[PDB]
Amino acid sequence: CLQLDPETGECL
Amino acid sequence: GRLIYTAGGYFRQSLSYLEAYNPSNGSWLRLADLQVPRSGLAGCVVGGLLYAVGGRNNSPDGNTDSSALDCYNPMTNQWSPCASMSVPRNRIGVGVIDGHIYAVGGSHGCIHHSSVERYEPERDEWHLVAPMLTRRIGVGVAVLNRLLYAVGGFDGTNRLNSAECYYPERNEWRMITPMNTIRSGAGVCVLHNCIYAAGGYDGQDQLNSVERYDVETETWTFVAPMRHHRSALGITVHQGKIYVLGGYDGHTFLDSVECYDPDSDTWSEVTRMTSGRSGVGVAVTMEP
Ligand SMILES: *CCc1cc(CC*)nc(N(C)CC(=O)OCC)n1
Known part of the structure; x- marks a missing residue:
């Protein structure tokens, strides 16, 4: 989802 | 080994x-945990010691960017704290030249750094050097022939295909030829006379492509892609x-x-x- 950083996968 | x-x-x-x-036997060993959790850090080795630099602790209780430098000694299986950097640096890149650690870029909250600082283990001190020409977080850093390269990343607004090189004796950064692909979060290393940039994110998709920069020809060439993006x-x-x-x-x-x-390109x-x-x-160092 767009709650994740697409580079790292981390929850924002 | x-x-x-x-x-x-x-x-x-x-x-x-x-x-x-251990590539020689396929084994994994679990060793002493870091004193503070961190992701987006970089590792490096100086004098047989492993260093963990920067990053951020993205925990259930919040996000804390790290200015920490910690040292792991395989002979004792213990972590020791070192002097901290001038600023926190999440998604930092690091390179070692002549026994000194260079910490490049990274973020502190919404601040995207162009600053660069250098650690001297013999004095346990960090000092700022010339900043990069571009702010870069998620930057790939590698050292070739005692020159430091900073490749790709994100400047606070755009992901980058640009790269630059630091010439320590002139304390100066200069742009090099840009990569053929925009990459933030790539892995960057050196092999033979080339700087390789693998993977990363181009703004739309995670990448499996890999390209290398020949420092004599100043060109980037794609090699075989990784199996996994x-x-x-x-x-x-x-x-x-x-x-x-x-x-x-x-x-x-x-x-x-x-x-x-590289010999078979596979x-x-x-x-x-x-x-x-x-x-x-x-990073790579001796067995514990
Ligand atoms: C889309 C899955 C997902 C991941 C995450 C981690 C940041 N969060 C959420 N949301 C919408 C729930 C929430 O409370 O996020 C804040 C941690 N969904």
Whole structure:
């Protein structure tokens, strides 16, 4: 989802 | 014998794992945890000691960017704190030249750094050097022929295909030829006379492509792509081969470790990490 950083996968 | 160490990373939260892989026998050893969890850090080695630099602790209780420098000694299996950097640096890049650690870029909250600082282990001191021409977080850093390269990343607004080189005796940064692909979160390393940039994120997709910069010709050329697309991967070189570890592919936190052989221009799967994770720090040093 767009709650994740697409580079790292981390929850924002 | 030499092992590939992986420190920190992220899966659900930032991690404090320190694990070491032995390419000679396929084993993984779990070693002393980092004192504080961190992802987006970088690892390096000076004088047989492993250093973990920067990052951020993305925990259930909040996000804290790190200015820390910690040192792991394989002979004691213990972490020791060192002097902290001038500023926190999440998604930092590091390179070692002549026994000194250069910390490049990274973020502190919404601040995207162009600053660069250098650590002297013999004095336990950091000092700022000339900043890069571009702010870069998620930057790949590597050293070739005692020159420091900073490749790709994100400047606060755009992901970059640009790269630059630092010439220590002139304390000056200069742009080099840009990559053929925009990459933030790539793994960057050196092999033979080339700087390799593997994976990363181009603004739309995680990448499996790999390109290398020949410092004599000033050109970037694509080599065989990795089997897995990945961003925020760990990377290192061991006995003439590149190893990529983990990362995020937009679906899974990868446990895959691939190895590139430059003579055959092929990638192969060599082992899996004990659990999938992104944003690790990696380096090679002696067995503990
Ligand atoms: C889309 C899956 C997902 C991941 C995350 C982690 C940041 N969060 C959420 N949301 C919408 C729930 C929530 O409370 O997020 C803040 C942690 N969904």
